[PDB]
Amino acid sequence: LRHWHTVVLASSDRSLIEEEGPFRNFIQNITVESGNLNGFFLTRKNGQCIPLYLTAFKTEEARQFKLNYYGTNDVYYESSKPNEYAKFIFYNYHDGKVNVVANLFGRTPNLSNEIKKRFEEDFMNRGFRRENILDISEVDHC
Amino acid sequence: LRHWHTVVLASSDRSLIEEEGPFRNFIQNITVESGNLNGFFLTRKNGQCIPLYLTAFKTEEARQFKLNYYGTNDVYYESSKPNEYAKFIFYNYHDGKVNVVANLFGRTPNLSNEIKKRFEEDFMNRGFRRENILDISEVDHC
Numbered sequence: 001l002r003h004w005h006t007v008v009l010a011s012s013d014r015s016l017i018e019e020e021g022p023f024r025n026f027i028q029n030i031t032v033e034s035g036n037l038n039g040f041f042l043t044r045k046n047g048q049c050i051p052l053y054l055t056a057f058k059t060e061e062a063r064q065f066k067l068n069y070y071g072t073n074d075v076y077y078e079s080s081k082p083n084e085y086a087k088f089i090f091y092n093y094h095d096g097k098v099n100v101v102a103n104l105f106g107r108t109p110n111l112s113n114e115i116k117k118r119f120e121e122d123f124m125n126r127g128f129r130r131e132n133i134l135d136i137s138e139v140d141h142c
Numbered sequence: 143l144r145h146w147h148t149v150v151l152a153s154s155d156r157s158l159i160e161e162e163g164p165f166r167n168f169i170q171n172i173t174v175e176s177g178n179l180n181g182f183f184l185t186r187k188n189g190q191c192i193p194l195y196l197t198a199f200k201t202e203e204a205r206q207f208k209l210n211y212y213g214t215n216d217v218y219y220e221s222s223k224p225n226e227y228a229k230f231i232f233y234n235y236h237d238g239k240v241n242v243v244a245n246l247f248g249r250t251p252n253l254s255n256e257i258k259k260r261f262e263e264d265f266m267n268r269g270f271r272r273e274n275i276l277d278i279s280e281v282d283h284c
């Protein structure tokens with residue numbers, strides 16, 4: 001779980017992942033430190049690209065983490081092929097309101113259409129609009 | 143996962159678990175079938191306690207399930223004391239809106255103070271009012 005790229009972002013609240021949104025972050029590296037996930041991202045804030053470091057701390061159960069950011073978050077990791085892609089589902093609690101932000105990471109800037117399609121269908125199968133899924137592999141970003 | 147009782151309900155949207163709420167259901171039994179969880183609950187409607195049968199389907203993750211109810215739900219099972227209690231977290235997706243409904247089940251109508259307190263503070267630590275936690279152990283319910 002080293003070198004990564006954010007390929008697709010999906011959220012119950014589109015603004016969370018729109019330009020300069022709190023969850024429009026682009027992963028660069030993920031370091032596992034004592035079961036915790038040390039993430040290094042880049043993000044655009046007021047006209048520039050800036051570094052963002054966040055640690056998702058382990059919990060009583062594997063693949064589930066806790067992260068303090070834009071409130072609190074329950075983080076779940078998933079992947080059939082851990083060396084090809086990584087999926088992180090964030091349930092963000094911001095002042096009493098809950099939102100889900102799904103992240104699809106790839107070893108390179110893009111991922112197979114198969115992986116991306118299933119990721120996107122799963123999101124849509126949960127009642128979310130296609131407009132809320134942002135494939136950033138086809139977009140220039142930080 | 144036999145005999146169970148709903149002891150505490152907690153939700154990001156209080157109305158979901160108050161009277162007439164879609165998630166104010168009382169577990170009676172949980173039967174495992176092919177990795178799936180077949181739950182039998184009671185629901186209060188028009189003065190009567192009515193049966194509610196729902197199957198939470200397995201996934202590529204042992205304690206994770208999928209459930210079609212009041213929209214769709216990603217369900218997670220947790221418990222450090224499997225024969226004493228069961229915790230089920232429902233991330234509900236209804237009309238593009240996300241809500242979290244946590245259920246604490248006991249072998250009997252009530253549960254250890256230690257278990258209930260940990261459950262309750264974990265929920266509160268995510269920015270929710272104590273108002274959103276309903277301990278029904280002493281409430282006359284189905």
Ligand SMILES: [Cl-]
Binds near residue numbers: 107108109
């Ligand atoms: Cl690369």
Ligand SMILES: [Cl-]
């Ligand atoms: Cl690169």
Ligand SMILES: [Cl-]
Binds near residue numbers: 249250251
């Ligand atoms: Cl009993």
Ligand SMILES: [Cl-]
């Ligand atoms: Cl009984």
Ligand SMILES: [Cl-]
Binds near residue numbers: 186282283284
């Ligand atoms: Cl009742």
Ligand SMILES: [Zn+2]
Binds near residue numbers: 003004107108109
């Ligand atoms: Zn690269």
Ligand SMILES: [Zn+2]
Binds near residue numbers: 146147251
């Ligand atoms: Zn009993």
